[PDB]
């Protein structure tokens, strides 16, 4: 018996940035409907990653019809990471309907904002 997420849970996380793990990532993406999901893949030793954190949170406050998540690419999440295909940090993955539809590498907040606008159409 596993857990299923619904409107209740999605409504509770919009407007914020939520950190997920290899066990809570998909249950959230699957409950997302047609709302785009953005995933910030970082590491604890990643400088540009921490520096981008406040901008990412700003984006999450501006776009309430997009779900912003973050994943620490460590040992416990090695699986999910490899499965999403990552070569560098930071990496942003945009998903829509259980599939990756975009990717931004590096702290290119400008290109990220473009991809987010694109996903919303």
Curated annotation (Swiss-Prot):
It is found in: Plastid, Chloroplast. The keyword Plastid applies. One of its GO terms (cellular component) is chloroplast. Keywords: Chloroplast, Disulfide bond, Electron transport, Plastid, Redox-active center, Transit peptide, Transport. Its main location: plastid. Residues 10-121 form the Thioredoxin domain. The record marks 47-48 as: Contributes to redox potential value. It comes from the Eukaryota. The active site is at 46 (nucleophile), 49 (nucleophile). Changing residue 49 to S: Prevents scission of the intermolecular disulfide bond by the second Cys of the active site. One of its GO terms (molecular function) is protein-disulfide reductase activity. The record marks 40 as: Deprotonates C-terminal active site Cys. Disulfide bonds join 46-49. Forms a complex with heterodimeric ferredoxin-thioredoxin reductase (FTR) and ferredoxin. Belongs to the thioredoxin family. Plant F-type subfamily. Participates in various redox reactions through the reversible oxidation of the active center dithiol to a disulfide. The F form is known to activate a number of enzymes of the photosynthetic carbon cycle. This is Thioredoxin F-type, chloroplastic.
């Amino acid at each position: 018996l596993e857990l299923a997420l619904g409107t209740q849970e999605m409504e509770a996380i919009v407007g914020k940035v939520t950190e997920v793990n290899k066990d809570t990532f998909w249950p959230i993406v699957k409950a997302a409907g047609d709302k785009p999901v953005v995933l910030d893949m970082f590491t604890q030793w990643c400088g540009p990653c921490k520096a981008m954190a406040p901008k990412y949170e700003k984006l999450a406050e501006e776009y309430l019809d997009v779900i912003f998540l973050k994943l620490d690419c460590n040992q416990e999440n090695k699986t999910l990471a490899k499965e999403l295909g990552i070569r560098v940090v930071p990496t942003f993955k945009i998903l829509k309907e259980n599939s990756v539809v975009g990717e931004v590498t590096g702290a290119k907040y400008d290109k990220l904002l473009e991809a987010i606008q694109a996903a919303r159409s």
